[PDB]
Design an enzyme around this catalytic site. Sequence first.
Site, PDB file in Angstrom:
ATOM      1  N   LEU A 271       0.821  -1.208   0.000  1.00  0.00           N
ATOM      2  CA  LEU A 271       0.000   0.000   0.000  1.00  0.00           C
ATOM      3  C   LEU A 271       0.851   1.252   0.000  1.00  0.00           C
ATOM      4  O   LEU A 271       0.502   2.221  -0.646  1.00  0.00           O
ATOM      5  CB  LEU A 271      -0.946   0.007   1.204  1.00  0.00           C
ATOM      6  CG  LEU A 271      -2.027  -1.082   1.150  1.00  0.00           C
ATOM      7  CD1 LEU A 271      -2.820  -1.121   2.449  1.00  0.00           C
ATOM      8  CD2 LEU A 271      -2.951  -0.888  -0.038  1.00  0.00           C
TER       9      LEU A 271
ATOM     10  N   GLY B 163       7.551   4.435   3.543  1.00  0.00           N
ATOM     11  CA  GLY B 163       8.077   5.749   3.911  1.00  0.00           C
ATOM     12  C   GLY B 163       8.783   5.674   5.239  1.00  0.00           C
ATOM     13  O   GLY B 163       9.200   4.602   5.660  1.00  0.00           O
TER      14      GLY B 163
ATOM     15  N   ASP C  18       1.514  13.738  15.052  1.00  0.00           N
ATOM     16  CA  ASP C  18       1.703  13.763  13.597  1.00  0.00           C
ATOM     17  C   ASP C  18       0.379  13.789  12.886  1.00  0.00           C
ATOM     18  O   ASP C  18       0.160  13.083  11.905  1.00  0.00           O
ATOM     19  CB  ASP C  18       2.568  12.563  13.138  1.00  0.00           C
ATOM     20  CG  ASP C  18       3.190  12.759  11.763  1.00  0.00           C
ATOM     21  OD1 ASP C  18       3.329  13.906  11.308  1.00  0.00           O
ATOM     22  OD2 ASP C  18       3.575  11.736  11.150  1.00  0.00           O
TER      23      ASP C  18
HETATM   24  N1  E2X Z   1      -5.712   0.097   6.741  1.00  0.00           N
HETATM   25  C1  E2X Z   1      -4.548   0.886   6.641  1.00  0.00           C
HETATM   26  C2  E2X Z   1      -3.770   1.044   7.667  1.00  0.00           C
HETATM   27  C3  E2X Z   1      -2.550   1.892   7.513  1.00  0.00           C
HETATM   28  C4  E2X Z   1      -2.221   2.473   6.376  1.00  0.00           C
HETATM   29  C5  E2X Z   1      -3.132   2.257   5.185  1.00  0.00           C
HETATM   30  C6  E2X Z   1      -4.198   1.518   5.343  1.00  0.00           C
HETATM   31 CL1  E2X Z   1      -5.269   1.269   3.994  1.00  0.00          CL
HETATM   32  N2  E2X Z   1      -1.032   3.240   6.287  1.00  0.00           N
HETATM   33  C7  E2X Z   1      -0.715   3.970   5.055  1.00  0.00           C
HETATM   34  C8  E2X Z   1       0.247   3.353   4.091  1.00  0.00           C
HETATM   35  C9  E2X Z   1       0.592   4.455   3.057  1.00  0.00           C
HETATM   36  C10 E2X Z   1      -0.607   5.079   2.331  1.00  0.00           C
HETATM   37  C11 E2X Z   1      -1.447   3.947   1.686  1.00  0.00           C
HETATM   38  C12 E2X Z   1      -2.390   4.405   0.568  1.00  0.00           C
HETATM   39  C13 E2X Z   1      -1.620   5.316  -0.396  1.00  0.00           C
HETATM   40  N3  E2X Z   1      -1.041   6.455   0.307  1.00  0.00           N
HETATM   41  C14 E2X Z   1      -0.054   6.054   1.281  1.00  0.00           C
HETATM   42  C15 E2X Z   1      -0.229   3.403   7.451  1.00  0.00           C
HETATM   43  C16 E2X Z   1       1.001   4.227   7.466  1.00  0.00           C
HETATM   44  C17 E2X Z   1       1.712   4.320   8.579  1.00  0.00           C
HETATM   45  N4  E2X Z   1       1.275   3.634   9.806  1.00  0.00           N
HETATM   46  C18 E2X Z   1       0.198   2.942   9.819  1.00  0.00           C
HETATM   47  C19 E2X Z   1      -0.601   2.811   8.567  1.00  0.00           C
HETATM   48  O1  E2X Z   1      -1.770   2.046   8.649  1.00  0.00           O
END
Ligand code: E2X
Length: 273
Positions: A12, A15, A135
């Site tokens: 997904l 970074g 953040d």
């Molecule tokens: N469910 C869930 C749970 C998530 C995260 C995404 C989803 Cl979908 N992410 C984001 C990953 C990067 C995004 C994804 C989409 C495109 N833009 C950048 C997290 C980023 C950092 N720490 C926890 C996160 O937890």
Amino acid sequence: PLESQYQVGPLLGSGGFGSVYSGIRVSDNLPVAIKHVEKDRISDWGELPNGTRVPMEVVLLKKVSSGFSGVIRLLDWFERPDSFVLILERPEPVQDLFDFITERGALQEELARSFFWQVLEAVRHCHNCGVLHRDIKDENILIDLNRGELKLIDFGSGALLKDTVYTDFDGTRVYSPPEWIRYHRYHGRSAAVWSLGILLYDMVCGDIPFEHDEEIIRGQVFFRQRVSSECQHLIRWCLALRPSDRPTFEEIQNHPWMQDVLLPQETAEIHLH
Ligand SMILES: Nc1cc2c(cc1Cl)N(CCC[C@@H]1CCCNC1)c1ccncc1O2
């Protein structure tokens, strides 16, 4: 048993937070996100009740994950020799607020009001549970597109909430307050309110107000598109240079701009479906 319990899907994103994959819990087909964090990249460690040393994010997510909230839930975690793996809730369909604003531009005020309100409720929940996010930004907000519900992610820069000064910060500089920039000192709630001002501007303008340290310190906001007088007032209040001149969370939620908020489902029906 990490590899047998979850079927790994596409990456997904990655970074400073690590790498996050789409996944499915094989037992019940539950949608999840699988977050990998390298141990070398963890500065901030906590300890669980039973003595086990873990990333601060695990401690903070456990503190907030009781009952319902606008916070993405920690479902499980695993330790590997060189990394931790966190299993997180994954709404489907979903889009992060950064991608949403990038695609759709500046948000209509009715939509921004609903989103901003839900962020305030989630931040209040964190604070009530003794957690400071540190953040808050569009990249750390997920939108459940069907339900209109927003969820906070990435507690990797977070801390236990305290009433004394913080002198460490590893969140996003362009959302950080002038007192951090100038003095390397801030208090938790008033710094959170500053970041909420940045967020609100971002929602109604389609971009963040400040790029450089000099702009943050000056604290002057200009509008490039039509934004209501009441919304502008709230933004400028949240972005007060002096921390003591910023609103409390109660003051934000009682502001004239925040009245008559839509519920999440109505918000999705009007703006997201
Ligand atoms: N469910 C869930 C749970 C998530 C995260 C995404 C989803 Cl979908 N992410 C984001 C990953 C990067 C995004 C994804 C989409 C495109 N833009 C950048 C997290 C980023 C950092 N720490 C926890 C996160 O937890």
